[PDB]
Amino acid sequence: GSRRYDSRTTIFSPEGRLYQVEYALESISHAGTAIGIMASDGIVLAAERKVTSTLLEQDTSTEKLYKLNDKIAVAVAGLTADAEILINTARIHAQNYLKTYNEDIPVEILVRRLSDIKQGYTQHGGLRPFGVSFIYAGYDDRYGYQLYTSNPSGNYTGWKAISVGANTSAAQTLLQMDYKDDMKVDDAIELALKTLSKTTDSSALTYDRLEFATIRKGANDGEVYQKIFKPQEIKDILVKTGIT
Amino acid sequence: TGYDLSNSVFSPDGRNFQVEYAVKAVENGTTSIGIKCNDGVVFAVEKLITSKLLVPQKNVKIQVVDRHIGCVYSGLIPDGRHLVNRGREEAASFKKLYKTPIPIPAFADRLGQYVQAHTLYNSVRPFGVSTIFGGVDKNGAHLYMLEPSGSYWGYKGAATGKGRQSAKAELEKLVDHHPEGLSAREAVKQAAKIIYLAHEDNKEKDFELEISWCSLSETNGLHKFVKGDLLQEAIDFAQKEIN
Amino acid sequence: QFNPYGDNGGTILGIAGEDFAVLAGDTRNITDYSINSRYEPKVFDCGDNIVMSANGFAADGDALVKRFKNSVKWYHFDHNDKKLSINSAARNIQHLLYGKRFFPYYVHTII
Amino acid sequence: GYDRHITIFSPEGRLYQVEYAFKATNQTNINSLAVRGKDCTVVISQKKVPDKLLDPTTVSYIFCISRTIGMVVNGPIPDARNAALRAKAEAAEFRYKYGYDMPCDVLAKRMANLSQIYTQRAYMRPLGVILTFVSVDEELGPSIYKTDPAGYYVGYKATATGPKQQEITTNLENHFKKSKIDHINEESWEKVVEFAITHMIDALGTEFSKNDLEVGVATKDKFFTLSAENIEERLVAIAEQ
Amino acid sequence: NNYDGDTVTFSPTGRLFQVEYALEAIKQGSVTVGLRSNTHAVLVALKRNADELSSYQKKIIKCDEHMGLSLAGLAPDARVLSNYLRQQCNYSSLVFNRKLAVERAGHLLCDKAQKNTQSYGGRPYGVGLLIIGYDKSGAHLLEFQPSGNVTELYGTAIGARSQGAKTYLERTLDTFIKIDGNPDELIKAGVEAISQSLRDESLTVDNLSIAIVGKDTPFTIYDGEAVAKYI
Amino acid sequence: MDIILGIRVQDSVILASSKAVTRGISVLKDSDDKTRQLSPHTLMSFAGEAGDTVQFAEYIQANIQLYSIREDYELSPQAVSSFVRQELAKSIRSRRPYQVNVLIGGYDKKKNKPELYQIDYLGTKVELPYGAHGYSGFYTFSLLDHHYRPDMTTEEGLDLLKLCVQELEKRMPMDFKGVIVKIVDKDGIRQVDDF
Amino acid sequence: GYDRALSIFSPDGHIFQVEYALEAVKRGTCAVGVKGKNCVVLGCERRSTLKLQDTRITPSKVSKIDSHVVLSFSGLNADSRILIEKARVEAQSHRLTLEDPVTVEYLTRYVAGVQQRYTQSGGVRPFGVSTLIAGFDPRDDEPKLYQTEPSGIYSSWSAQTIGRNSKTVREFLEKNYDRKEPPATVEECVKLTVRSLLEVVQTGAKNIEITVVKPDSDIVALSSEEINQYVTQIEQEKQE
Amino acid sequence: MTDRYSFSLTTFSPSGKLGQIDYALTAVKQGVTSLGIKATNGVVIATEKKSSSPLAMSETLSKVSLLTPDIGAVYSGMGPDYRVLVDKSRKVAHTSYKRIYGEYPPTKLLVSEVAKIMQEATQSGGVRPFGVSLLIAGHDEFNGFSLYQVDPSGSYFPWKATAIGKGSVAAKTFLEKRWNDELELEDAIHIALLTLKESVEGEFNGDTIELAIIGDENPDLLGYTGIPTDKGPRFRKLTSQEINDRLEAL
Amino acid sequence: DRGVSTFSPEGRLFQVEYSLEAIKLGSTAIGIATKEGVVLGVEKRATSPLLESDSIEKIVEIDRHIGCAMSGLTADARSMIEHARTAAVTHNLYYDEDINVESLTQSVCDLALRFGELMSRPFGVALLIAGHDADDGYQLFHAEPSGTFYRYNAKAIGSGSEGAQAELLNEWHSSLTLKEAELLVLKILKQVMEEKLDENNAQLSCITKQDGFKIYDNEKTAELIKELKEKEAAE
Numbered sequence A: 001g002s003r004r005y006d007s008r009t010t011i012f013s014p015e016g017r018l019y020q021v022e023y024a025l026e027s028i029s030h031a032g033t034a035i036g037i038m039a040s041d042g043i044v045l046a047a048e049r050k051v052t053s054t055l056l057e058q059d060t061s062t063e064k065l066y067k068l069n070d071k072i073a074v075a076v077a078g079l080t081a082d083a084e085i086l087i088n089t090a091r092i093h094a095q096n097y098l099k100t101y102n103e104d105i106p107v108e109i110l111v112r113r114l115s116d117i118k119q120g121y122t123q124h125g126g127l128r129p130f131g132v133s134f135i136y137a138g139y140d141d142r143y144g145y146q147l148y149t150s151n152p153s154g155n156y157t158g159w160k161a162i163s164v165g166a167n168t169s170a171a172q173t174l175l176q177m178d179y180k181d182d183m184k185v186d187d188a189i190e191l192a193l194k195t196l197s198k199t200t201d202s203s204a205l206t207y208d209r210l211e212f213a214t215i216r217k218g219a220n221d222g223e224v225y226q227k228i229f230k231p232q233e234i235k236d237i238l239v240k241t242g243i244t
Numbered sequence B: 001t002g003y004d005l006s007n008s009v010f011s012p013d014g015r016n017f018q019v020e021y022a023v024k025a026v027e028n029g030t031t032s033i034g035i036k037c038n039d040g041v042v043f044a045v046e047k048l049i050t051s052k053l054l055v056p057q058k059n060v061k062i063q064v065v066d067r068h069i070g071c072v073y074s075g076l077i078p079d080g081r082h083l084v085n086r087g088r089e090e091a092a093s094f095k096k097l098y099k100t101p102i103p104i105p106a107f108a109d110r111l112g113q114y115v116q117a118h119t120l121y122n123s124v125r126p127f128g129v130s131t132i133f134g135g136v137d138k139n140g141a142h143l144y145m146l147e148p149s150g151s152y153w154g155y156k157g158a159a160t161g162k163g164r165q166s167a168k169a170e171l172e173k174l175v176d177h178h179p180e181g182l183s184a185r186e187a188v189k190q191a192a193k194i195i196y197l198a199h200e201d202n203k204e205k206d207f208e209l210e211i212s213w214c215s216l217s218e219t220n221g222l223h224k225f226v227k228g229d230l231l232q233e234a235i236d237f238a239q240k241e242i243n
Numbered sequence C: 001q002f003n004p005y006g007d008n009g010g011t012i013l014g015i016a017g018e019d020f021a022v023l024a025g026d027t028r029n030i031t032d033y034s035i036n037s038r039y040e041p042k043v044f045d046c047g048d049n050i051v052m053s054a055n056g057f058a059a060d061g062d063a064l065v066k067r068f069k070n071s072v073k074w075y076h077f078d079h080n081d082k083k084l085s086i087n088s089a090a091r092n093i094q095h096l097l098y099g100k101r102f103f104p105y106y107v108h109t110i111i
Numbered sequence D: 001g002y003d004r005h006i007t008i009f010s011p012e013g014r015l016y017q018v019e020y021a022f023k024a025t026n027q028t029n030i031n032s033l034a035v036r037g038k039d040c041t042v043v044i045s046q047k048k049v050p051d052k053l054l055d056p057t058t059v060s061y062i063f064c065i066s067r068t069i070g071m072v073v074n075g076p077i078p079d080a081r082n083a084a085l086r087a088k089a090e091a092a093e094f095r096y097k098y099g100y101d102m103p104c105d106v107l108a109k110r111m112a113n114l115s116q117i118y119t120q121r122a123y124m125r126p127l128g129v130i131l132t133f134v135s136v137d138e139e140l141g142p143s144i145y146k147t148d149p150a151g152y153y154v155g156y157k158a159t160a161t162g163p164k165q166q167e168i169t170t171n172l173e174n175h176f177k178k179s180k181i182d183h184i185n186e187e188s189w190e191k192v193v194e195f196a197i198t199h200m201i202d203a204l205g206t207e208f209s210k211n212d213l214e215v216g217v218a219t220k221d222k223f224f225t226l227s228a229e230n231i232e233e234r235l236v237a238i239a240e241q
Numbered sequence E: 001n002n003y004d005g006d007t008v009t010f011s012p013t014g015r016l017f018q019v020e021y022a023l024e025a026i027k028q029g030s031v032t033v034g035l036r037s038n039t040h041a042v043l044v045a046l047k048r049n050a051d052e053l054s055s056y057q058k059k060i061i062k063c064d065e066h067m068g069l070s071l072a073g074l075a076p077d078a079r080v081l082s083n084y085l086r087q088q089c090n091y092s093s094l095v096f097n098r099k100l101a102v103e104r105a106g107h108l109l110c111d112k113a114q115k116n117t118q119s120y121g122g123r124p125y126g127v128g129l130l131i132i133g134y135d136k137s138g139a140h141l142l143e144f145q146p147s148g149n150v151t152e153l154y155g156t157a158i159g160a161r162s163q164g165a166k167t168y169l170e171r172t173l174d175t176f177i178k179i180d181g182n183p184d185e186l187i188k189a190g191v192e193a194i195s196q197s198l199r200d201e202s203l204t205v206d207n208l209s210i211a212i213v214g215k216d217t218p219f220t221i222y223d224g225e226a227v228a229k230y231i
Numbered sequence F: 001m002d003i004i005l006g007i008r009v010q011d012s013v014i015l016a017s018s019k020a021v022t023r024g025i026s027v028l029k030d031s032d033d034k035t036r037q038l039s040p041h042t043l044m045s046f047a048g049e050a051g052d053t054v055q056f057a058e059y060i061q062a063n064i065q066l067y068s069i070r071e072d073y074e075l076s077p078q079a080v081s082s083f084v085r086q087e088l089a090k091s092i093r094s095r096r097p098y099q100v101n102v103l104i105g106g107y108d109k110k111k112n113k114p115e116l117y118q119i120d121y122l123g124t125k126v127e128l129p130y131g132a133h134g135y136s137g138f139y140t141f142s143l144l145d146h147h148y149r150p151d152m153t154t155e156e157g158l159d160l161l162k163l164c165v166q167e168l169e170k171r172m173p174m175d176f177k178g179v180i181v182k183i184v185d186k187d188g189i190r191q192v193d194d195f
Numbered sequence G: 001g002y003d004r005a006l007s008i009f010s011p012d013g014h015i016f017q018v019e020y021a022l023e024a025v026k027r028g029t030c031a032v033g034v035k036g037k038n039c040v041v042l043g044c045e046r047r048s049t050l051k052l053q054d055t056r057i058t059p060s061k062v063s064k065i066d067s068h069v070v071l072s073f074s075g076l077n078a079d080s081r082i083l084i085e086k087a088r089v090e091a092q093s094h095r096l097t098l099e100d101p102v103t104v105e106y107l108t109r110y111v112a113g114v115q116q117r118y119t120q121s122g123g124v125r126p127f128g129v130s131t132l133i134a135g136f137d138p139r140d141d142e143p144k145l146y147q148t149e150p151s152g153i154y155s156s157w158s159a160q161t162i163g164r165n166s167k168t169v170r171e172f173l174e175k176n177y178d179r180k181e182p183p184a185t186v187e188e189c190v191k192l193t194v195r196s197l198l199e200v201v202q203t204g205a206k207n208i209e210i211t212v213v214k215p216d217s218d219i220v221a222l223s224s225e226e227i228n229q230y231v232t233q234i235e236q237e238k239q240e
Numbered sequence H: 001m002t003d004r005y006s007f008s009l010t011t012f013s014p015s016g017k018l019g020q021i022d023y024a025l026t027a028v029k030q031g032v033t034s035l036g037i038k039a040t041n042g043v044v045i046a047t048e049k050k051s052s053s054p055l056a057m058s059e060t061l062s063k064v065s066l067l068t069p070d071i072g073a074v075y076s077g078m079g080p081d082y083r084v085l086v087d088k089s090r091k092v093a094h095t096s097y098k099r100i101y102g103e104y105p106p107t108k109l110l111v112s113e114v115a116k117i118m119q120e121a122t123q124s125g126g127v128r129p130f131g132v133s134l135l136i137a138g139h140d141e142f143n144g145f146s147l148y149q150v151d152p153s154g155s156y157f158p159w160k161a162t163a164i165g166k167g168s169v170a171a172k173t174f175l176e177k178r179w180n181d182e183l184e185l186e187d188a189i190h191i192a193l194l195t196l197k198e199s200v201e202g203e204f205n206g207d208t209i210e211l212a213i214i215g216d217e218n219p220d221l222l223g224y225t226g227i228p229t230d231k232g233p234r235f236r237k238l239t240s241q242e243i244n245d246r247l248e249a250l
Numbered sequence I: 001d002r003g004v005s006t007f008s009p010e011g012r013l014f015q016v017e018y019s020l021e022a023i024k025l026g027s028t029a030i031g032i033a034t035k036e037g038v039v040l041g042v043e044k045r046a047t048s049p050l051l052e053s054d055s056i057e058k059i060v061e062i063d064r065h066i067g068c069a070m071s072g073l074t075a076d077a078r079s080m081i082e083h084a085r086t087a088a089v090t091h092n093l094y095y096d097e098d099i100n101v102e103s104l105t106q107s108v109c110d111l112a113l114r115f116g117e118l119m120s121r122p123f124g125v126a127l128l129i130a131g132h133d134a135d136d137g138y139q140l141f142h143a144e145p146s147g148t149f150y151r152y153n154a155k156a157i158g159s160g161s162e163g164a165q166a167e168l169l170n171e172w173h174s175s176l177t178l179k180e181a182e183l184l185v186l187k188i189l190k191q192v193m194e195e196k197l198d199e200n201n202a203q204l205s206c207i208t209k210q211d212g213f214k215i216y217d218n219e220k221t222a223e224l225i226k227e228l229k230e231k232e233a234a235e
């Protein structure tokens, strides 16, 4: 029968590793780097677009940074198509919670459920896992600003600063070097861009190969604002820190 | 390679080796035949007497579908029974909806489509039988032969099993020598002769002859088994011809 | 509207002695003011020295007896030809009857 | 190399099972041909009955799908009949659902879509057949639409299928280069059938008796097949010219 | 070799190896014999133990008052098939008030076994059965093979060294077929038949199993001290 | 079914619920507690069809307790009331709806405010300074409309509540066998034993 | 539905998928359970290749199943969440029908049953997780500590460890734990737990988590400084 | 019987590649060249009509398809896969949008739905990915004109201009030299025809080229009058004659 | 790979045969049947000294008149026991009587072959089922994952089974008292066990008509161990 052609996507290696999860992580390590940095007064999301062509429409484009609700956003590293499946599920989940409790969903609850979906694809169903790692940046009134990451295994962890995708080893060492706890958003913006600039596989970091976003309480009084940076705004912030 | 390990897989030739392998199982089976006649059809089959302990006349191989169709087959006997059970379900539902008993060409396609369906997936095995069948309907007599691939045609005479080539040669002579037609009672006698002649290819064990027929005049368009005086008369006719 | 029940009349009676028991029943079967049969038995030997009658609506009565007789048969198959005691039969019949609690067998049963 | 056993892509982006299903198409060693007249669409196919024990009237690769649509198959008969029954059911359902007769090209698309599914879904094999649908459509007029195991389909001015299809194709091409038109400029279907047989004889280089051929004809409001004597009448007409 | 991974695969010579391997399980099974006259049908079965501390695996199963079988091979498969026969016999009685013909019983088993040889995931039954019965056309004996093949016989045997009993019955055919109206003699012939399949072991009191059905005899099984008469 | 009252004052929510369980012409019990603690600072009183009431109350209790353990966190009274409303709003179009009316009294620790929600079996939610279900409101609301201040103490609320119970004991046709009174505030839930 | 039998017997009688799930447990961070005279202490290793972590929000290694029972684990983190969720739901379901919280044995038996089910169900792989389940039965002051593993077997332990280098810390506990006299106080039990982790861990900084469970739903997690005091005290006694 | 293939046929290899997606892209590479160019007041999509036989009527085979009155699609790769995707794309525009909001979906969202369908063929049980790359051009009130590429993986990218298939590498380079942000629709059509001539080998006329635009509303193509707000489809397929007119002033 | 329900060329089911190897790795369990009762004894075999041995539960009650011992992958036995208990109680509900020991065993063995491509694999545990009923008296059954069960006068399963079975062959006779059987299980367990036998690493139990199924205390077994050592030294 069909047994012959079954890859057995949800089995253990003799060493106790999940083949498909390990190979999905290997896939993700070739994706454009994405960085999240959590400051005391906000969060920065920075991500490098995968080798751009000059004829690509840059302003009406979304590849790395997606909005889940008004208080939560994600940076993507891996297969974009896979990520959008998960993003839509996450968006719906947030609305289900709001409909049920009349309160915006706590960040961890959303992260857990999305990570639980990934976990399922590694234990049952015989399907390939999602080749995606997320960086979650969000705010709620319990823990305030939070950064999380999830990967194809469905395992998630919280961070002060973190990178996913390509050159995470080098990127993490650089973040670990210059990060401190009393940091502000504008400092974090600079660290994020400086780290990408040094870890990039490109010749020089330019505005057209970046997506950028901040989550501040920099609205008016006790409320949170999501700012997905426009091309010109990335061009300006790149000049303001003296990278170009 | 490995193209022959799974059903429904095309080889680089464009062949389904699993069906061709099922044909080998049919070639291994005992000889069965069908003769079309003036106003009906005649079926006969070789029953190898493995032992003295087999009860004579009591391991019947020819099967009736509805009241007007007869079916006989060579190869894996259980597979043939499965096909007839389906045939009976198909004939019952046809009669249920359309009132009239199922026409033979209609019935032939019902089996054909079902057998063909067992070449479409790797989760099923092809049928290990070639089935000779037919009867009488509103348009007269029809004889068919169906193979593991689902392929079937109308026949003047049909043969399958270990002695198919011997039987075919003998069938071709009847078609040549009788262009106007063969009578039902004659076809019964000829069927006996041909089974006896085809038995030369399976002559270690001696055998038991079984015949059936549908005829507009002789059986009133219904399927009946040939028994008693008419059977012994046909056996004697066959015995005289081999010597 | 279709009424799935009927009344076939008749009456039954069971008495127990020290070392015996009787189960009696009249043989008349009726509908309304008509006699269907003057001899239609409704007391049956079910095997294992158990006699049974289900009186009321005969269709339900026959169905129940038929099912219990069959229950005795399978009790033997499943428990090495063990004899079904009268107390075990009683409990078994309770489950047969209560299984149709929301579409009852319209009968009074005695064994 | 299990990528050659089921319908998944090979490293060079090919589907070998689909390619091998195309080779099954020629397993019968029969050539078919279709042409269009002004009022009609004629399809012809070779009829080879090798066994003397066969009932020749039951040997056919032309099917009457609906009153208006006919279909000739190039490929093994079991798959051919599978396709025919489905086409008949599809055409019948279409009429019931939508209140008008299923067009030839729409049926062709539908059958092509079903074929496409078998090239994408693993559990279903492709049918080793090429289906040529013919009609005189009430909107588009004389129509020839052809389906293959890849799920490809297209309309034709004329077409041919089989082992010696290329010879027939170029023969027809050269005629339409000469005539400068999209069809056979002829009034009666009888002479369009005569054209079809004539050009098949030239391309294949063989002569035909009445039992070596099989002819289907589509006119307005009916498709029908010809008897041996109808073809014989047609063969006599060609010979006497 | 490459064609024995499952029942859905034919070999290049047209063989079903999984069915043949199921057939092999019967050959390893303990010998059982079946034979009949015109009035009675008899099963005789050699039971097998694990060791001297264990019981002897029961080989014979009752299906109805007029029918029953003996088994050789996988016993749980015999339980499944016998249970199916019990239901089919029972359906015939409840619905049609009709005792199931022994021939129909054979046809039903054939078709049940066949379905397990043509589909993916399943496996063939790993047991052979000898069905005896008395119905409206007299006494009967059937041989069931898990290939689906069911065969009506005067006498037969299946299991290890069954060829000895099968040869004996083939010689004795003319004698035992005319043992009419005499149960004990028909059994004696069956006990002598199964003795031709014994090696180093002989028939003891908790070793031998005999069943009989006939004209005025319901299907009944004899074990223990009830078979001491026949040793 | 019977008298469940609720009064939200300055610093607490007070729930009063009748003690009688009557079936037919018999008062089967006179000490029944028609309430469940959903979380340390959230109490729900309930009232409606026999069986349905407790079955619904305990089902809600289980769900909130499950949430508490999962998140190591107490849901706000508003969040709990919305969850409860949705469950009833689902129920009303089921094959057999829960015929249960509830009051939810809670103290929001993040806001440092008492909150009283009235939800009927249809899933009709309202936040109120004082609430009642059934015929009880027909008597007590005019009394509360008069005497209630939003800045009352817990003691003033209890006296206001005594006035309601007295009016009900005077004009109501049945003997509801008094009430069990419970207070929800910053320190959690406690029962008044002498009422 | 996906049906494949992934957990099957091999010729030597092993179920490799279950045994490979144990290798995942062996890779996981060390976890230890020690029960005293009046308490149980759950200690957990946290690897220090991860700096820049946010410990406020990062999933804790010890999880409350109910107010009186806790669950720690070693192995795949994502897998453990599924077991914890199911356990928490069963805890509430038990309170609802029996009107009494679960016993630690019952909760353990349930979790172990779930793990076993995933070793002979089609289309699923076993859990790459072993658990330590600790707590006190309702209205009972006798400490309870249980262990489960991917196969589905469970048992009670006076003290036990799971995860990487667990064989080293088990060695330590085997000579340092007296059955006749378990750690008489909370302090003694925490210290023996911290000592056992210090055989394997590295630095006693933000690498060790300690959770203390006492009778009648009295569970608290120790902070860095509180744990660091045990680390500081143990090292000074060691230099001798 | 029944679909026993409930497992993924596309899986990650040790190097991290998804083999079947890569091989699907290889099939797209073999496919005939198609391109799209976005102007300020419209979009043009074009492709070569590779005829299988001169007896075939290439008009009956449409490579450029209307999805909504304001959205059109073209492809490179496997034609049959494209045909069924168009059927599914047309239906999903109704079921998941028009039947809910009473209006047609914006380009980006319809593209998103097609991408989802293609992503699922990459993960679901017993199916291979689609062997096509799509170029979808369209207009909507709040986003204006747009052009998208959808790949076998389900990924989509917005483009100012691009090409896919056989000679896409050279064609993209050609478009980079010619494209500016001030191109008018007629200028974009001109560049489209120039770019396509490089990749076409045989005949280059209105019968071998298929070309459609997304531009102004066409009231004459609406089929009815009387509703002021309904002004007609922005999608229009250029006729064989209309192409030849522009090939003279080339 | 290959089908789960595949036959070997010798006519055996691969998976069933492989599960039998798993059972050979299991801890020893012994059962002896007498006319005064049936005794069930098991080797606990704690993997470590810190493990509290009294939590090792390899002898189990099915009903008052039926007990059970296990060997092999003991986690697999839980659902088998659950089914056995339900089967026993259900029969009492339907028939107001105790269910026969053989009928119970047959019901458990019906689960065995319900695997394939139903559960994904056979059980990796063998059971010794001991009980009493009015018809056939005291009985001991060995239930395998093949779906087969034999009645035994005495039987050992597990790692020390073939050695212990040979010993049981010599020692068993039809007149053994209950006390004699108790000592015999202890004696044979002590012979095949790795570690030295005591009340903490071995467990005894019995089923009698009068008192039903009882698991012995560690105090009671300890005295039987002391009684056994004294009797072997006494000649």
Ligand SMILES: [Cl-]
Pocket (backbone or CB within 6 Å): D109, D110, D113, D114
């Ligand atoms: Cl379609």
Ligand SMILES: [Mg+2]
Pocket (backbone or CB within 6 Å): D006, D007, D118, D119, D120, D121, D122, D123, D124, D125, D126
């Ligand atoms: Mg396929």
Ligand SMILES: [Mg+2]
Pocket (backbone or CB within 6 Å): F118, F119, F120, F124, F125
């Ligand atoms: Mg209300």
